[PDB]
Design a protein around this motif. Sequence first.
Motif, PDB file in Angstrom:
ATOM      1  N   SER B  42      -6.082  -3.261   9.747  1.00  9.79           N
ATOM      2  CA  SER B  42      -5.895  -4.392   8.848  1.00  9.79           C
ATOM      3  C   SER B  42      -4.527  -5.030   9.091  1.00  9.79           C
ATOM      4  O   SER B  42      -3.685  -4.507   9.823  1.00  9.79           O
ATOM      5  N   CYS B  43      -4.300  -6.174   8.446  1.00 10.06           N
ATOM      6  CA  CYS B  43      -3.007  -6.830   8.576  1.00 10.06           C
ATOM      7  C   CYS B  43      -1.878  -5.897   8.149  1.00 10.06           C
ATOM      8  O   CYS B  43      -0.877  -5.744   8.860  1.00 10.06           O
ATOM      9  N   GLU B  44      -2.035  -5.245   6.993  1.00 13.68           N
ATOM     10  CA  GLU B  44      -1.007  -4.319   6.527  1.00 13.68           C
ATOM     11  C   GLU B  44      -0.801  -3.181   7.522  1.00 13.68           C
ATOM     12  O   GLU B  44       0.328  -2.771   7.789  1.00 13.68           O
ATOM     13  N   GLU B  45      -1.887  -2.647   8.063  1.00 17.00           N
ATOM     14  CA  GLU B  45      -1.778  -1.526   8.984  1.00 17.00           C
ATOM     15  C   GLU B  45      -1.126  -1.930  10.303  1.00 17.00           C
ATOM     16  O   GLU B  45      -0.369  -1.146  10.885  1.00 17.00           O
ATOM     17  N   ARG B  46      -1.410  -3.143  10.800  1.00 14.96           N
ATOM     18  CA  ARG B  46      -0.727  -3.645  11.992  1.00 14.96           C
ATOM     19  C   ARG B  46       0.779  -3.669  11.785  1.00 14.96           C
ATOM     20  O   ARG B  46       1.555  -3.278  12.666  1.00 14.96           O
ATOM     21  N   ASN B  47       1.214  -4.111  10.604  1.00 17.20           N
ATOM     22  CA  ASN B  47       2.643  -4.167  10.332  1.00 17.20           C
ATOM     23  C   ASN B  47       3.246  -2.779  10.261  1.00 17.20           C
ATOM     24  O   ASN B  47       4.377  -2.576  10.705  1.00 17.20           O
ATOM     25  N   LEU B  48       2.519  -1.819   9.696  1.00 19.78           N
ATOM     26  CA  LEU B  48       3.017  -0.442   9.683  1.00 19.78           C
ATOM     27  C   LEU B  48       3.208   0.086  11.100  1.00 19.78           C
ATOM     28  O   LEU B  48       4.214   0.744  11.397  1.00 19.78           O
ATOM     29  N   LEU B  49       2.198  -0.109  11.953  1.00 22.60           N
ATOM     30  CA  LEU B  49       2.305   0.315  13.342  1.00 22.60           C
ATOM     31  C   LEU B  49       3.543  -0.284  13.986  1.00 22.60           C
ATOM     32  O   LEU B  49       4.308   0.413  14.664  1.00 22.60           O
ATOM     33  N   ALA B 109     -12.726 -10.133  21.717  1.00 19.64           N
ATOM     34  CA  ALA B 109     -13.098 -10.459  20.354  1.00 19.64           C
ATOM     35  C   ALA B 109     -11.847 -10.359  19.503  1.00 19.64           C
ATOM     36  O   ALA B 109     -10.778  -9.970  19.988  1.00 19.64           O
ATOM     37  N   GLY B 110     -11.964 -10.704  18.236  1.00 20.33           N
ATOM     38  CA  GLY B 110     -10.808 -10.660  17.387  1.00 20.33           C
ATOM     39  C   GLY B 110     -10.507 -11.987  16.747  1.00 20.33           C
ATOM     40  O   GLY B 110     -10.737 -13.064  17.304  1.00 20.33           O
ATOM     41  N   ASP B 111      -9.997 -11.899  15.538  1.00 17.98           N
ATOM     42  CA  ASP B 111      -9.440 -13.061  14.889  1.00 17.98           C
ATOM     43  C   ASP B 111      -8.112 -13.405  15.533  1.00 17.98           C
ATOM     44  O   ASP B 111      -7.446 -12.556  16.123  1.00 17.98           O
ATOM     45  N   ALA B 112      -7.750 -14.682  15.464  1.00 18.24           N
ATOM     46  CA  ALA B 112      -6.560 -15.127  16.168  1.00 18.24           C
ATOM     47  C   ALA B 112      -5.340 -14.335  15.726  1.00 18.24           C
ATOM     48  O   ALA B 112      -4.499 -13.967  16.553  1.00 18.24           O
ATOM     49  N   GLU B 113      -5.235 -14.043  14.428  1.00 15.54           N
ATOM     50  CA  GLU B 113      -4.044 -13.380  13.917  1.00 15.54           C
ATOM     51  C   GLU B 113      -3.820 -12.061  14.639  1.00 15.54           C
ATOM     52  O   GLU B 113      -2.718 -11.780  15.129  1.00 15.54           O
ATOM     53  N   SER B 114      -4.868 -11.250  14.749  1.00 16.56           N
ATOM     54  CA  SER B 114      -4.704  -9.947  15.369  1.00 16.56           C
ATOM     55  C   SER B 114      -4.497 -10.075  16.872  1.00 16.56           C
ATOM     56  O   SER B 114      -3.664  -9.375  17.446  1.00 16.56           O
ATOM     57  N   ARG B 115      -5.250 -10.955  17.532  1.00 16.21           N
ATOM     58  CA  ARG B 115      -5.104 -11.081  18.978  1.00 16.21           C
ATOM     59  C   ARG B 115      -3.692 -11.520  19.352  1.00 16.21           C
ATOM     60  O   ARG B 115      -3.102 -10.999  20.308  1.00 16.21           O
ATOM     61  N   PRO B 161      -1.738 -22.686  12.595  1.00 15.67           N
ATOM     62  CA  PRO B 161      -0.861 -23.813  12.282  1.00 15.67           C
ATOM     63  C   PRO B 161       0.552 -23.554  12.768  1.00 15.67           C
ATOM     64  O   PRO B 161       0.957 -22.395  12.956  1.00 15.67           O
ATOM     65  N   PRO B 162       1.330 -24.614  13.001  1.00 15.48           N
ATOM     66  CA  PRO B 162       2.684 -24.437  13.547  1.00 15.48           C
ATOM     67  C   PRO B 162       3.641 -23.687  12.634  1.00 15.48           C
ATOM     68  O   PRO B 162       4.676 -23.224  13.118  1.00 15.48           O
ATOM     69  N   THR B 163       3.314 -23.518  11.355  1.00 16.79           N
ATOM     70  CA  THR B 163       4.129 -22.746  10.425  1.00 16.79           C
ATOM     71  C   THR B 163       3.692 -21.290  10.307  1.00 16.79           C
ATOM     72  O   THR B 163       4.329 -20.524   9.586  1.00 16.79           O
ATOM     73  N   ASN B 164       2.634 -20.883  10.986  1.00 15.29           N
ATOM     74  CA  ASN B 164       2.149 -19.529  10.807  1.00 15.29           C
ATOM     75  C   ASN B 164       3.252 -18.538  11.180  1.00 15.29           C
ATOM     76  O   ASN B 164       3.833 -18.652  12.272  1.00 15.29           O
ATOM     77  N   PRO B 165       3.589 -17.576  10.312  1.00 13.68           N
ATOM     78  CA  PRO B 165       4.718 -16.688  10.642  1.00 13.68           C
ATOM     79  C   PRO B 165       4.524 -15.869  11.906  1.00 13.68           C
ATOM     80  O   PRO B 165       5.509 -15.598  12.594  1.00 13.68           O
ATOM     81  N   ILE B 166       3.303 -15.453  12.227  1.00 11.76           N
ATOM     82  CA  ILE B 166       3.081 -14.708  13.463  1.00 11.76           C
ATOM     83  C   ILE B 166       3.350 -15.594  14.675  1.00 11.76           C
ATOM     84  O   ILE B 166       4.027 -15.186  15.623  1.00 11.76           O
TER      85      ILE B 166
END
Lengths: 7, 229, 228, 6
Positions: B42-49, B109-115, B161-166
Amino acid sequence: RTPSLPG
Amino acid sequence: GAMGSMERASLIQKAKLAEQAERYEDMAAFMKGAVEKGEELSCEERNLLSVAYKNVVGGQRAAWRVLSSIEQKSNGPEVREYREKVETELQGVCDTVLGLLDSHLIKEAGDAESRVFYLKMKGDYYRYLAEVATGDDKKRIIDSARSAYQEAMDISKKEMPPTNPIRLGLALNFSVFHYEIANSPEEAISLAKTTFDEAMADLHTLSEDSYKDSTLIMQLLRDNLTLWT
Amino acid sequence: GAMGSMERASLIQKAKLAEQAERYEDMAAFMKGAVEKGEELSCEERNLLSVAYKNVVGGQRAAWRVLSSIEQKSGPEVREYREKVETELQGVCDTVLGLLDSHLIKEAGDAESRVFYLKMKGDYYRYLAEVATGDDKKRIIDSARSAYQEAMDISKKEMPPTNPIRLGLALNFSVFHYEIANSPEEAISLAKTTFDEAMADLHTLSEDSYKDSTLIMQLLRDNLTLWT
Amino acid sequence: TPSLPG
Ligand SMILES: *N1CCC[C@@H]1[C@H](c1ccccc1)c1cccc(OC)c1
Ligand SMILES: *N1CCC[C@@H]1[C@H](c1ccccc1)c1cccc(OC)c1
Ligand SMILES: [Cl-]
Ligand SMILES: [Cl-]
Ligand code: NA
Ligand code: NA
Ligand code: NA
Ligand code: NA
Ligand code: NA
C-alpha cells in the motif's frame, strides 16, 4: 553534496 | 528466510514499532519480509519500506564519506581496508533494495503512483552505488540510474499532475543526479526550474493540506536552484 | 573471533576510525578483538572500550524502554519485539562481562584500572538487571553488588576521595542501590558519605581537578535531591 | 535516576 529528498 | 514464518501484518506492525524505536535495520528487515509475502504494498507500506532503507543506507553513506575523506588526506593499509569494509556493506544494502525492486515490486502493471515510486527508488539506489563506484563500472551504474529515473519521469509527466508530491520528489532527485553524478549542471538547473514553475502554476487547484505537501517539496527544489545559481 | 587475524595496533587504529565515523558497533567489535589479544589496555584504550560498548548498549536500552512503554500502555507483536531487543541487549552485556572476566579484571596492573573494570562489571550486570525477572534478576543483582563492592574496597584503600573514577563508581553504585536493589537508604548513605569525603579535600586540588570532582559531586547531589 | 555520563 546537494541535498536530495529527505524521505 | 528469518521472516518467512511471520504473518505479513505482524511484520508491518513490527516495522512501525522499529521506526518508533529508531531501529532502522530491524525496520528494513521487517519490511523486506513483508515484501516477500508477494502482495502489493500500500501507499503507507511503500513509505515504510523507503524510510527504513533510507536510514540504513544514509548511515553507511555518511560513514563512507568520513572514511573516504580521511583516506584522501592520508594520500599502513588500515584506512583503506575499513573504508572498503563500509563500502562493501553499503553496496550490499543497495543490492538488496534493487533486488527487492526487480524481483517483487517493479511491474509493468501498476498504478502510476506505485510505478513511479519504485522506479525513482531504483534510480536512487543506483545513484548511491554510483557515489562509490569508479571508472567504467561507474559509467554503467550511472546509465542504470539515468534509465530508471527517465522511465519514472515519462510516466509521471503523462499520468500525474505537476504538483503531485511523488512526481516532485522524483524531479528533485533526478536533478540532483544530473548535478552531482552525471556532470550535467545545466540539465539539473533546467529540470529544477521547469518543475518548480509548472507546479507553481497548478497550486491553485489544491486543498490546504495538498498545498502544504506540494509546496514543501517545491521549497526543496528552490533551495537547490538557489544553491546552484 | 572474527578479529583474530588482525594486528592489535590495526584494531586500535580502526576503533578510532569507527568512532570518527560514528560506527559504534564496529568500534566495539574492534575493541573486543584488541582485548582478546590478551595484553593489558592503556588508559586511552580502556576509555575506547567503554565508549564503544556504552554507545551500543545505550542505544539498545533506549529502544527497550520505548518498546516497554508501548507494551505497558497496551496481539503479541509488541512483546515479541521487546523480547528481541532484550535478547540482543543481554548478548552485548554478556559479551562485555566476558571480556572483563576473561581476563581484564585479573590482569589489571594498577588500582585505577582494576576499579575501572570492576565498576564496568557492576554497570553491565546492572543493565542486565533492568531487563531481568525472577530468580535470574536476583542472581544478577547479587553479582552487580559484589563487583561494585570490590571496586569500592579498592578505591577506598588506593585512591583519594576526590579521584573522579572513585567518585563515578560511588555514583553508579548508589544508582544501583536506589533503582535496582530497592535500597534507598544505602543509596543515600553512599552518595552522602562520598559527597562529604570529597568536599573535605576540594581545597587541595588544582583548578582542573576541582572542576572534575565538583562536576561528579553535582551528579551525586542531583540524585540526592531526587531521592530526598 | 541518571548514572555517570561516560
Ligand atoms: N521519502 C521517500 C518515500 C518515504 C519518504 C517520504 C517523504 C518524507 C519527507 C519528505 C519527502 C518525502 C514519506 C515518508 C513517510 C510518510 C510519507 O507520506 C507520504 C512520505
Ligand atoms: N565514562 C566512563 C569511561 C569513558 C567515559 C569517560 C567519561 C566521559 C564523560 C564523563 C565521565 C566519564 C570518557 C569518555 C570519553 C573520553 C574520556 O577521556 C578522554 C573519558
Ligand atoms: Cl576493516
Ligand atoms: Cl520480533
Ligand atoms: Na512462510
Ligand atoms: Na492521474
Ligand atoms: Na544563489
Ligand atoms: Na601481532
Ligand atoms: Na497484532
